[PDB]
């Protein structure tokens, strides 16, 4: 059902890509390292690697992350009460001008979900958005989060072009999941979450890089449940995105979905920019 097209590495004005960003929900940093996730990254050779759901719990990170001379500047954020839940990471070849954490909203900053890395010509934000939960028990909160996240990004974007990436926990449109009819009342595809995504795009403003480039391509997913071998039947959801300021659209070369990369229930996504 899906084969990501070849990497286009020149922007529309012919400028070659100078920045390769990779984002990946690793479903557990160590479990992922064990599944050989780091080798795939070594092959991808991105300049910036953004990781979501690291689930780290101790006073030390895996030694394997010290073997990356190409992604030597590493930033991490895990829950205040760090216990195998959530957690994000941002590893960069070059040193950002500034790395901050959270969105400046206490009640939304206790779960190690956001890292902001400011660069010369843009600000990068990696996020692991709160899942609405089984039985939608956390849907009211998620709407409060969406609202606060949106407003934070709108403010960052007002000072410098923005690139948001990560596992945003929402398949925006019907084309973003294999079973839209059966999930309208499940976390990730509720009207509230879909509205929230559409509202993020409108308010910042932000453009969905992959959909902007492949507006009619179906079956492009970044997550398949481990249950019932959904990855092999390509029964999935597109939950990971690279959202960008409109001002960055002429620098956009390509937004990829590395469907073949194993190591998690999410596959990595990659962005090429000519800055
Ligand atoms: Pt199934
Ligand atoms: Sm998970
Ligand atoms: Sm508040
Ligand atoms: Sm529609
Ligand atoms: Sm340049």
Swiss-Prot record:
Q: What is the effect of changing residue 260 to A?
A: Reduces the interaction with TOMM20
Q: Which residues carry this modification: N6-acetyllysine?
A: 154
* Residues bearing PTM Phosphothreonine: 190
Q: Name one GO molecular function term.
A: 3'-5'-DNA exonuclease activity
How is this protein induced? Up-regulated in presence of reactive oxygen species (ROS), like bleomycin, H(2)O(2) and phenazine methosulfate.
Q: How is its activity regulated?
A: NPM1 stimulates endodeoxyribonuclease activity on double-stranded DNA with AP sites, but inhibits endoribonuclease activity on single-stranded RNA containing AP sites.
Q: Where does Mg(2+) 2 bind?
A: 167, 169, 266
Q: Which consequence is recorded for altering residue 95 to A? A: Does not abolish the redox activity
What's the impact of mutating residue 169 to A? Abolishes AP endodeoxyribonuclease activity
Q: Where in the cell is it found?
A: Nucleus; Nucleus, Nucleolus; Nucleus speckle; Endoplasmic reticulum
Which residues are listed under the site Important for catalytic activity?
240
UniProt comment concerning the protein's domains: The N-terminus contains the redox activity while the C-terminus exerts the DNA AP-endodeoxyribonuclease activity; both functions are independent in their actions. An unconventional mitochondrial targeting sequence (MTS) is harbored within the C-terminus, that appears to be masked by the N-terminal sequence containing the nuclear localization signal (NLS), that probably blocks the interaction between the MTS and Tom proteins.
Q: What name does this protein carry? A: DNA repair nuclease/redox regulator APEX1
List the top taxonomic levels of the source.
Eukaryota, Metazoa, Chordata, Craniata, Vertebrata
């Amino acid at each position: 059902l899906y084969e990501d097209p070849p990497d286009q590495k020149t922007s529309p004005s012919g400028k070659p890509a100078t920045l390769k960003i990779c984002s990946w929900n690793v479903d557990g940093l160590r479990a992922w390292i064990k599944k050989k996730g780091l080798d795939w990254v070594k092959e991808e050779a991105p300049d910036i690697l953004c990781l979501q759901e690291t689930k780290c719990s101790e006073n030390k990170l895996p030694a394997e992350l010290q073997e990356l001379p190409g992604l030597s500047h590493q930033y991490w954020s895990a829950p205040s009460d760090k216990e195998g839940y959530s957690g994000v990471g941002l590893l960069s070849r070059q040193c950002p001008l500034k790395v901050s954490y959270g969105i400046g909203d206490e009640e939304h900053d206790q779960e190690g979900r956001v890292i902001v890395a400011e660069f010369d010509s843009f600000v990068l934000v990696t996020a692991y958005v709160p899942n609405a939960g089984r039985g939608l028990v956390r849907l009211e909160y998620r709407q409060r989060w969406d609202e606060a996240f949106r407003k934070f990004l709108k403010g960052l974007a007002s000072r410098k072009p923005l690139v948001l990436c990560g596992d945003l926990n929402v398949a925006h449109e019907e084309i973003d999941l294999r079973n839209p009819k059966g999930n309208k009342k499940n976390a990730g595809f509720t009207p509230q979450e879909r509205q929230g995504f559409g509202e993020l795009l409108q308010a910042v403003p932000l453009a969905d890089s992959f959909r902007h480039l492949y507006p009619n391509t179906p079956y492009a997913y970044t997550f398949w449940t481990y249950m019932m071998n959904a990855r092999s039947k390509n029964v999935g959801w597109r939950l990971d995105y690279f959202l960008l300021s409109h001002s960055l659209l002429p620098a956009l070369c390509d937004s990829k979905i590395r469907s073949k990369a194993l190591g998690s229930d999410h596959c990595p996504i990659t962005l090429y920019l000519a800055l």
